[PDB]
Amino acid sequence: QAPRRPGIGTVGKPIKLLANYFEVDIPKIDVYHYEVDIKPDKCPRRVNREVVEYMVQHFKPQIFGDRKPVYDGKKNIYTVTALPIGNERVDKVSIKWLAIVSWRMLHEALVSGQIPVPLESVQALDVAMRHLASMRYTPVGRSFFSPPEGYYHPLGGGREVWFGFHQSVRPAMWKMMLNIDVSATAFYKAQPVIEFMCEVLDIPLTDSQRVRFTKEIKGLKVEVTHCGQMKRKYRVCNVTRRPASHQCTVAQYFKQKYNLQLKYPHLPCLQVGQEQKHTYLPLEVCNIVAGQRCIKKLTDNQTSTMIKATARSAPDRQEEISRLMKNASYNLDPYIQEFGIKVKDDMTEVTGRVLPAPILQYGGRNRAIATPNQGVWDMRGKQFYNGIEIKVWAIACFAPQKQCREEVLKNFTDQLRKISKDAGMPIQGQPCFCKYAQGADSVEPMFRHLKNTYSGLQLIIVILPGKTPVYAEVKRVGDTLLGMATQCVQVKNVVKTSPQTLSNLCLKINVKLGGINNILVPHQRSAVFQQPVIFLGADVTHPPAGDGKKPSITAVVGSMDAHPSRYCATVRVQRPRQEIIEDLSYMVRELLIQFYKSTRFKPTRIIFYRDGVPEGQLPQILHYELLAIRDACIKLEKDYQPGITYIVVQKRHHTRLFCADKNERIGKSGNIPAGTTVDTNITHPFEFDFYLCSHAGIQGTSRPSHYYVLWDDNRFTADELQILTYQLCHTYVRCTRSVSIPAPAYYARLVAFRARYHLVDKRDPQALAKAVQVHQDTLRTMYFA
């Protein structure tokens, strides 16, 4: 199915790099795979590990001997040579022979390259290299975290930050590799509940405070400690709104045991400890566990604090990785020594290439040309390719009168007019409207009156007072109801003025009205553009945890010209928690119809850029989608067959690239330059994929993006596709920079988030499907950017 690599690239200049991959050499033996069972299985994995260790320690001279098993945690167990018992379930813990796993076959599959490698051997090796670390550290997902010591990084609200690393095993071209990278994740700090209460309260108590505390305490489990360290974690799923202590005497027992009246007996208790049995627990003396990690909600201030707490330059990260690898001491592990596995202790040396950058053509009276330098360029002194003249416009202010007077408004208007006229899109005359309003319930009549009175309205500017709930209402009224263009800006950018802010505002305004900023030079491009071509992109977003009523949202966008500069979008709503776009056929058919209407031609090629998908589910994704696209193609006309290319882009991994030479570090943080391509020595042995870093990082260490071709039909080479992706990375309209992923996927993400904003509400499924749909006037324009 998946095509084989047709070769390696040549275009570019060489560069020396280092990656965080440490080799592993495995011997050619045969391991025996068993299965174990634990009854009941409601308990966590740690107690299962303890029970299995106790059993293997106390049953050595009966069924195990002197042999050291490698355990998994749930069902699997491995042993170096066969247990002389049989394949029959026997005890309530059972074990039976299951299969045979061979490493010689894996070695031959890696060396030959024409034979794909299996998965049982890889799983066996991965379990083999994780017993001691999981025995000592605290596993969370696929990473090991250790409680902090010698430092303290609060986040506010009873949350702490713990550090650790991430380990996994991946195949390579001639042998196997081990992947290490540092990480950090928020946890719940351990402390008595009184200061937790005063922290979450952030100050008779208003019922709003009780509701907030009930919402913030959701999902935890308190543990009774005074009963001789029972560690009886209590299943808390929902706290009743009205306390049930008033509807096993409570007050009598309390006043007889503590014999004290205290100060605030009116505080409510929490329904805990076998709610069905109704065995209540006090909260005067209580604590929390030190291993709890929940998603819940993350705010902007906490996010910024965590970014400040975890960000560090590239050389520091490299030194920390090397120090951690030296400290691990994998060559003294008894379990690794039993199987006979040797591991290196140095980073892998790869060789990459730096691709050339394109040149962008502007317009105007001079017809200037801009050449990017280190992935950035400026516009000062250049006109737009196609400017739009603005004749009618209005101003609506939602900020209070005291914070924005008339003179500051006139100054801001004058500055915007001057800069816009300089850039090539002239704003003519004085505004025809300027007033003040208040509240979220006044947007609709105001916009309706403005639409009714002035016939030729072109743009409306709205000023918001910080973070306010009226933004969603403004967007909903503008898009799905009346169909008028809008632009928003905050007061803090009006009181003070900077040229770059106004330049970016003009950049957005011009394309919202139907203009073009810049295009690639036609002769600099590839040879694929000699015939009609269409570019597509898709994305799907899932609702956050806890919520179950919110559905999923999909999005597909496509180009409508040969530059390409213009895009159109479609959006739908589907069943919660599904990884398939169920309506791909209709979306693609509609996009093809619109392309034909705009261009007067029918495309002969299709390029698809699917956004992030899980790495373990791609075969059925491809199998369903490819058939869906072909089905959409066949319905439009008989015997119509365009070549299809399928590409998936991934940005969630743990691979980092550093510089071998000191002089070649660029910038403050010393990151790799923009445009480095790696496709050898760390990639799949016989498939078609590569790495690319097409943006210049500011702070921290950059993340290269992973591309993976699934189905190809146009007989492309490797360098052609790499150059095409790099060039498509340069056509983003919201800034004069280079972005991390191609334009169509980024636009699809923007469309999905805008639809999510549309769905807010401050017969049901048809109502949602109608709500997501937009008006006909703004349907075929670039409203999302």
Side-chain angles (χ1 to χ4, degrees):
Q1 284 293 130
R4 315 211 288 98
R5 185 185 307 272
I8 62 170
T10 312
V11 182
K13 72 182 188 71
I15 187 183
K16 303 291 178 69
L17 307 167
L18 296 172
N20 56 351
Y21 278 174
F22 310 99
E23 308 177 2
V24 162
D25 284 347
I26 51 175
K28 309 155 193 167
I29 51 162
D30 295 333
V31 73
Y32 294 107
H33 169 228
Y34 293 168
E35 161 166 310
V36 75
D37 209 332
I38 304 296
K39 322 189 68 57
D41 54 86
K42 192 263 288 181
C43 297
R45 291 178 280 174
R46 320 297 293 272
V47 286
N48 298 328
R49 271 205 176 88
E50 290 184 358
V51 164
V52 167
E53 285 313 295
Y54 187 93
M55 179 256 269
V56 71
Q57 205 279 339
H58 282 83
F59 288 95
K60 293 178 56 60
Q62 165 62 34
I63 47 173
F64 275 115
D66 58 352
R67 204 151 271 180
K68 305 205 103 192
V70 161
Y71 187 39
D72 189 12
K74 66 184 289 184
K75 291 174 71 175
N76 307 342
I77 181 170
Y78 293 75
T79 317
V80 66
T81 300
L83 264 62
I85 170 64
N87 51 359
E88 308 84 1
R89 160 165 291 181
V90 48
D91 300 0
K92 45 193 186 304
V93 176
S94 59
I95 182 165
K96 54 191 93 152
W97 175 88
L98 191 150
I100 304 306
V101 176
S102 179
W103 286 350
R104 154 171 290 102
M105 202 85 47
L106 168 73
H107 177 250
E108 311 296 90
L110 281 193
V111 176
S112 65
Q114 308 174 120
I115 290 83
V117 293
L119 312 176
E120 324 299 329
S121 296
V122 180
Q123 180 182 1
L125 185 49
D126 204 10
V127 182
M129 293 180 183
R130 201 195 287 269
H131 199 233
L132 198 85
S134 174
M135 183 177 176
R136 166 154 67 237
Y137 286 111
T138 298
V140 176
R142 281 212 282 181
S143 298
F144 309 104
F145 294 114
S146 77
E149 294 293 328
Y151 56 90
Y152 197 45
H153 298 85
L155 261 53
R159 293 185 182 178
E160 216 163 353
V161 161
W162 293 24
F163 286 100
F165 61 104
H166 154 272
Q167 184 199 187
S168 78
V169 176
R170 292 177 59 84
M173 321 275 288
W174 281 88
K175 65 178 72 66
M176 291 216 88
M177 306 279 192
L178 183 76
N179 179 83
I180 298 286
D181 189 9
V182 299
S183 281
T185 300
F187 275 74
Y188 274 40
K189 84 170 55 182
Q191 87 273 27
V193 71
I194 183 167
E195 64 260 24
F196 183 78
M197 183 177 177
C198 71
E199 193 164 346
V200 303
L201 200 60
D202 213 1
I203 182 66
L205 303 186
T206 310
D207 288 1
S208 61
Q209 299 186 347
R210 184 213 52 237
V211 167
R212 263 67 165 183
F213 164 64
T214 300
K215 189 50 198 180
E216 275 289 330
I217 203 69
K218 201 265 181 186
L220 307 189
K221 330 228 297 134
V222 83
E223 283 82 11
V224 32
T225 179
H226 62 102
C227 290
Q229 310 315 121
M230 187 65 73
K231 196 180 180 181
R232 191 61 181 86
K233 322 163 279 292
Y234 282 142
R235 57 183 69 189
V236 184
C237 61
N238 172 38
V239 183
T240 182
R241 297 200 291 187
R242 305 178 77 168
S245 175
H246 305 78
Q247 171 58 46
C248 198
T249 70
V250 172
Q252 302 161 22
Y253 187 90
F254 266 115
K255 286 150 199 168
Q256 283 161 359
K257 173 146 176 286
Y258 285 164
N259 65 86
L260 281 175
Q261 201 265 329
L262 316 164
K263 281 301 180 179
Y264 309 98
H266 53 84
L267 57 89
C269 67
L270 72 164
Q271 185 179 25
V272 73
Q274 284 73 240
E275 298 85 3
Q276 310 94 2
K277 200 155 65 171
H278 289 287
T279 56
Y280 299 84
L281 212 71
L283 62 91
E284 310 286 331
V285 193
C286 274
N287 296 294
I288 193 66
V289 290
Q292 260 182 336
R293 200 263 312 183
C294 67
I295 293 293
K296 281 299 294 306
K297 178 202 304 169
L298 204 61
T299 69
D300 169 65
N301 286 331
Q302 295 159 348
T303 314
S304 160
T305 313
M306 212 175 98
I307 307 304
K308 186 53 141 204
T310 187
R312 64 186 66 189
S313 46
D316 294 335
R317 174 168 299 249
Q318 177 174 6
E319 308 287 355
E320 188 164 358
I321 290 292
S322 277
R323 188 270 299 164
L324 187 55
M325 198 44 195
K326 295 293 193 295
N327 189 359
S329 287
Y330 273 100
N331 292 307
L332 281 53
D333 205 8
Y335 300 98
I336 296 170
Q337 262 194 280
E338 161 180 34
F339 285 69
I341 302 170
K342 280 73 176 175
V343 184
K344 300 290 186 293
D345 46 354
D346 282 328
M347 277 190 173
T348 317
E349 300 219 40
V350 302
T351 298
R353 292 171 292 112
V354 173
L355 299 168
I359 49 183
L360 288 91
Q361 156 90 57
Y362 273 92
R365 48 188 183 94
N366 296 343
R367 294 199 102 209
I369 288 176
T371 69
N373 179 264
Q374 297 177 8
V376 72
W377 70 98
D378 66 15
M379 182 185 37
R380 285 291 91 181
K382 305 171 188 67
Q383 325 284 326
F384 282 160
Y385 194 79
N386 191 297
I388 312 298
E389 294 179 353
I390 305 181
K391 315 218 178 271
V392 191
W393 54 298
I395 300 296
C397 180
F398 282 89
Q401 182 84 299
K402 64 193 161 263
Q403 273 144 30
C404 184
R405 305 312 319 278
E406 312 146 10
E407 59 271 14
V408 291
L409 269 182
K410 312 331 201 173
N411 198 7
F412 166 77
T413 305
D414 174 351
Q415 288 292 315
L416 182 72
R417 258 166 51 75
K418 187 182 306 298
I419 290 175
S420 52
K421 183 192 140 282
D422 197 4
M425 154 195 87
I427 290 182
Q428 307 281 2
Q430 217 75 11
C432 74
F433 197 66
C434 191
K435 280 209 198 133
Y436 297 93
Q438 193 94 50
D441 291 331
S442 174
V443 170
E444 179 161 27
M446 207 199 180
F447 279 23
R448 207 178 296 262
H449 173 262
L450 278 175
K451 183 180 177 68
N452 281 345
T453 309
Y454 309 86
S455 57
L457 210 47
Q458 277 204 285
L459 180 68
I460 304 185
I461 286 175
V462 184
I463 307 179
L464 309 163
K467 199 181 144 35
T468 187
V470 310
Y471 171 79
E473 160 87 347
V474 159
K475 280 314 167 183
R476 176 184 73 88
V477 165
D479 288 340
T480 64
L481 210 64
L482 296 149
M484 281 166 318
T486 52
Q487 185 64 49
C488 298
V489 68
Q490 270 190 342
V491 179
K492 66 174 266 187
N493 302 324
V494 174
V495 176
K496 83 188 210 196
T497 295
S498 182
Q500 268 287 349
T501 310
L502 306 190
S503 184
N504 286 339
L505 265 187
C506 291
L507 266 170
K508 277 160 72 78
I509 281 172
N510 180 72
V511 71
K512 267 195 186 187
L513 266 68
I516 297 182
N517 298 6
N518 49 22
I519 66 168
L520 293 170
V521 188
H523 61 86
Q524 266 290 343
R525 303 178 320 212
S526 165
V528 65
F529 294 99
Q530 303 303 40
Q531 301 187 7
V533 184
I534 190 167
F535 299 88
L536 303 166
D539 192 313
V540 61
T541 62
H542 309 294
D547 296 339
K549 191 192 66 176
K550 304 212 71 83
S552 295
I553 297 179
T554 65
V556 172
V557 308
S559 85
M560 301 299 178
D561 55 7
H563 294 332
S565 293
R566 279 204 49 249
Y567 288 82
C568 293
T570 61
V571 61
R572 294 276 212 285
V573 166
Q574 77 178 22
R575 197 193 62 181
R577 314 221 71 91
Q578 193 183 171
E579 271 96 10
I580 297 289
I581 298 173
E582 300 183 348
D583 288 327
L584 196 64
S585 180
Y586 286 128
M587 312 187 170
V588 172
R589 173 158 158 283
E590 154 168 0
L591 287 182
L592 283 185
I593 280 178
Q594 193 58 37
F595 185 91
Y596 176 76
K597 288 284 173 68
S598 287
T599 303
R600 293 292 151 203
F601 270 131
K602 208 178 274 283
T604 71
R605 292 190 172 100
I606 297 180
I607 313 295
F608 204 89
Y609 275 100
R610 180 78 151 89
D611 202 75
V613 296
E615 72 273 16
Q617 307 182 40
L618 58 89
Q620 64 268 18
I621 298 288
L622 158 71
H623 172 76
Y624 185 82
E625 288 205 23
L626 205 64
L627 274 180
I629 298 180
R630 265 201 271 270
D631 189 359
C633 279
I634 193 66
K635 294 285 193 294
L636 183 63
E637 183 178 1
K638 207 178 49 65
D639 217 322
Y640 176 44
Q641 263 151 20
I644 304 178
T645 306
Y646 204 104
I647 302 185
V648 58
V649 64
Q650 185 70 41
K651 271 209 65 169
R652 264 211 201 271
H653 51 69
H654 293 87
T655 285
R656 316 257 179 161
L657 295 158
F658 311 103
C659 280
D661 211 17
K662 164 163 271 213
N663 305 349
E664 297 207 79
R665 302 193 209 159
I666 182 167
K668 181 178 74 174
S669 296
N671 285 281
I672 47 174
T676 57
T677 308
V678 179
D679 59 347
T680 52
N681 268 336
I682 61 171
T683 55
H684 208 267
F686 83 112
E687 295 202 339
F688 197 33
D689 69 332
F690 57 92
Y691 277 95
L692 187 86
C693 186
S694 56
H695 73 293
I698 315 179
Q699 82 284 355
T701 307
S702 305
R703 293 180 181 177
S705 289
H706 191 207
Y707 300 83
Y708 183 56
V709 177
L710 276 172
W711 181 269
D712 190 9
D713 218 336
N714 300 119
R715 315 281 159 241
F716 281 160
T717 61
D719 57 356
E720 279 191 355
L721 197 53
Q722 294 175 358
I723 294 285
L724 176 57
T725 303
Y726 193 41
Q727 286 181 354
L728 262 176
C729 275
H730 273 106
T731 79
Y732 195 60
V733 299
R734 295 176 68 186
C735 62
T736 52
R737 265 180 162 265
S738 189
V739 291
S740 64
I741 49 185
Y746 209 93
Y747 287 145
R749 295 175 61 249
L750 289 179
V751 169
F753 286 76
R754 177 54 74 88
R756 177 53 58 89
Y757 263 120
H758 272 167
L759 263 178
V760 65
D761 203 6
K762 167 166 149 272
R763 312 300 280 259
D764 212 5
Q766 59 92 26
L768 299 186
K770 205 188 70 82
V772 175
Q773 168 97 50
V774 300
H775 200 260
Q776 298 276 131
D777 275 321
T778 61
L779 172 43
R780 314 251 161 211
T781 198
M782 185 180 288
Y783 70 98
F784 44 82

